[PDB]
Design an enzyme around this catalytic site. Structure first.
Site, mmCIF file in Angstrom:
data_model
loop_
_atom_site.group_PDB
_atom_site.id
_atom_site.type_symbol
_atom_site.label_atom_id
_atom_site.label_comp_id
_atom_site.label_asym_id
_atom_site.label_seq_id
_atom_site.Cartn_x
_atom_site.Cartn_y
_atom_site.Cartn_z
ATOM 1 N N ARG B 211 -4.499 94.517 73.661
ATOM 2 C CA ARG B 211 -4.044 95.899 73.625
ATOM 3 C C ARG B 211 -5.247 96.831 73.740
ATOM 4 N NH1 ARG B 211 -0.281 93.531 70.171
ATOM 5 N NH2 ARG B 211 -1.609 93.675 68.302
ATOM 6 N N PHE B 227 7.724 93.485 80.273
ATOM 7 C CA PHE B 227 8.067 92.831 79.013
ATOM 8 C C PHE B 227 7.398 93.617 77.901
ATOM 9 C CE2 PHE B 227 9.820 89.401 81.303
ATOM 10 C CZ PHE B 227 8.937 89.063 82.322
ATOM 11 N N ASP B 249 12.030 96.267 80.016
ATOM 12 C CA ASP B 249 12.516 95.214 79.137
ATOM 13 C C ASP B 249 14.042 95.219 79.200
ATOM 14 O OD1 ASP B 249 11.073 93.448 76.893
ATOM 15 O OD2 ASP B 249 13.083 93.955 76.171
ATOM 16 N N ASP B 299 2.828 90.276 80.139
ATOM 17 C CA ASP B 299 2.827 89.339 79.022
ATOM 18 C C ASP B 299 4.238 88.792 78.831
ATOM 19 O OD1 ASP B 299 3.220 91.404 76.037
ATOM 20 O OD2 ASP B 299 3.764 91.841 78.126
ATOM 21 N N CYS B 339 0.777 82.181 76.577
ATOM 22 C CA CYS B 339 0.580 81.647 75.233
ATOM 23 C C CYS B 339 1.140 80.234 75.117
ATOM 24 C CB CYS B 339 1.254 82.557 74.208
ATOM 25 S SG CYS B 339 0.622 84.246 74.235
#
Lengths: 395, 395
Positions: B211, B227, B249, B299, B339
């Site tokens: 961020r 997202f 989103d 992300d 991730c």
């Protein structure tokens, strides 16, 4: 004119836009070209794949200048490439308060074999491949047109040129001769560089972010900077408010410049020590008597077993990092690096992990460093990532 | 005093202090132990190597609590571990302006299977392994002792537990119930977190540095945040002075919180757009009509093609990143992440490089991201590094 024909199947790298063509993938050469001469590279059927520079004395038989069939490699070609690279560095300079930066990072800026670093009003060249030297005149013309007020200096005194079958060379190219020490700026900090005789092109611009990161870790802490060279990390530690920073190096000249750097930034000399000594010897002396530090910056040069691409096993890294861990207080932070071609980031990590075990202390990896943004790595050339480093915390 | 005997020459892992003991390494169990119970680990000759927790339903048959022969696992054990971990977070919080952070990152803080996040005055637990659950009472006692004024909430609703032979569980533990949204601070920015029903423990503290980096690239630029979820990146873009930030989103709830975060920080709402729609669809819609952005944050959710570490092999990341690259102009920047344990940093790099070629453009890797410093990776546990990310510049 001349064409390099790839062996059947061996064109996959080109389709991936990789800038290098190994000698082993070449089936035959159609025509005779000079060292560094512009040639076309085609597949086993003769279909054009790219336009590059021929390197007869190297295993990297050719490097790709362009994948555009209509693009000739001339002054205009270099001018366009320089302008594209400059656009990026203009943004970086404004954002990070830079007066100096790497302008072209070879393959990653679309100019394989060419590296150019900007230091104030000086442009420092390193023509490392056959194509780079061959195009010297065209490159210079483009540079003079785009940067009329800048001086151009040549630091092509790099051993890699032997791999390309060329003699090493260095010296003035145009404009004024650089001063022994020239002040440059990064992140509100001033540093003195020696263009004519300093390491690489005069300084290590690639460690810019590692130096900046040092500032965050050192507030009111005791710092040890090993292989300090001209003290970039020492000044950074003082800028960060360290209580004390000890710089160790084998070169008195480098240490003198380090002190000049502290004075230049009007920092507190009382908080800085410059020790000229065999790093390994000093580290053991400190350890044997239980000296302790909160932050240690470890950035050694040719790992020792340098050039030893074969018999590498240069675990001078394990010994150096083990000693560092032994000199840290609990919660101490180790900023350790390596640019050796004999190891990857993963192997470097294992060495640190192993140093920790032998030192009898566990460490946590809390940050991973990378060469600065002016040293981009084009996605088609992963090998471009050479600087490895981590921030480790002793538990 | 049940013991786990290791096959001859299979204790090398413990000698490297790795926290995991896989089933294939177990020679025989001398005794009968319950799930999560404390046990001893010895070699084929019976020599003590470590004290861990038994997990009969897992591939990871045992996780090491300690390698100290005299260390019993009780309230004091957890108290010491919590205090040692707190020391690091106290430094990080003051340095990065945090009132929230991950306190214990399992194995990396000497507590395998245990994760604890701090959000203001709330401690959120996640007991993922057999041992973590078995030691719940002891861990809770230490916590109430060290943090008497904090409320404790449990978010052990993680699929990992099933693989350890347990069922998922979540709910209050002690203190007051967390509010619908709790504002937390990081780098002078405020963000709203939902401890009871939010992702993970209520927020992604691990993306803190991602961020932060977003702020560096957005001044006066049009940003696309794919997202967006409850925000985080949208606020960061605005904090960086972006000219416009569009967040996409499918969840209207997440988008409402994103906008709330913007207002909470007193940022210019006139520069923030929230689009509720399928991210893939909106992307192809923008692509189809030639929409262009200067910076794109990518992300993706949970792997999209997870269903196991190996069930990956899905080019959703490839397709999604390709669309992103097609939405950028020259100089455009892509901040993309992963991730999933479905791929290493190098594999993710390969995908982006492939996406780049299919997009018909070259990209430069100028920065590499990783989980924040409060999510450390102990040198004995390399698998601990799960968050991968890159900043890519379009040439």
């Amino acid at each position: 004119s001349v064409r390099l024909v790839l062996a059947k199947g061996r064109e996959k790298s080109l389709l991936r836009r990789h800038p290098w063509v190994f000698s082993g993938a070449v089936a035959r050469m159609e025509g005779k070209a000079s060292l560094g001469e512009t040639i076309d590279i085609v597949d086993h059927q003769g279909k054009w794949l790219a336009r590059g520079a021929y390197s007869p004395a190297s295993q990297i038989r050719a490097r790709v200048w362009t994948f555009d069939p209509s693009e000739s490699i001339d002054i205009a070609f270099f001018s366009r490439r320089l302008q594209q690279a400059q656009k990026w560095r203009d943004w970086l300079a404004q954002k990070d308060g830079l007066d100096s930066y790497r302008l072209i990072a070879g393959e990653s800026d679309g100019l394989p074999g060419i590296t150019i670093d900007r230091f104030g009003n000086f442009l420092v060249l390193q023509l490392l491949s056959a194509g780079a030297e061959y195009q010297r005149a065209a490159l210079i013309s483009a540079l003079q047109t785009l940067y009329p007020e800048c001086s151009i200096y040549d630091r092509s005194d790099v051993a890699v040129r032997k791999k390309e079958g060329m003699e090493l060379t260095q010296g003035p190219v145009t404009g004024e001769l650089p001063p022994a020490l020239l002040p440059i700026e990064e992140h509100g900090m001033k540093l003195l560089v020696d263009i004519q005789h300093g390491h690489k092109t005069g300084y290590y611009l690639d460690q810019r972010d590692s130096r900046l990161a040092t500032r965050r870790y050192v507030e009111n802490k005791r710092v040890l900077n090993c292989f300090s060279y001209t003290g970039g990390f020492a000044v950074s530690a003082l800028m960060g408010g360290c209580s004390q920073v000890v710089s160790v190096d084998t070169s008195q000249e480098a240490l003198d410049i380090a002190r000049q750097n502290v004075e230049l930034n009007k920092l507190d000399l009382s908080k800085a020590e410059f020790v000229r000594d065999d790093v390994f010897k000093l580290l053991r002396t400190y350890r044997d008597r239980g000296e302790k530090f909160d932050v240690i910056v470890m950035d050694p040069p040719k790992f020792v077993e340098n050039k030893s691409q074969l018999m590498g096993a240069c675990r001078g890294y394990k010994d150096i990092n083990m000693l560092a861990i032994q000199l840290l207080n609990e919660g101490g932070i180790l900023l350790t690096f390596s640019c050796s071609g004999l190891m990857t980031s993963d192997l470097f990590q294992k060495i640190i992990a192993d140093a920790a075990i032998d030192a009898g202390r566990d460490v946590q990896f809390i940050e991973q460093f990378r060469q600065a943004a002016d040293h981009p790595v084009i996605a088609t050339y992963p090998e471009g990532l050479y600087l490895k480093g981590f921030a480790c915390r002793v538990m």
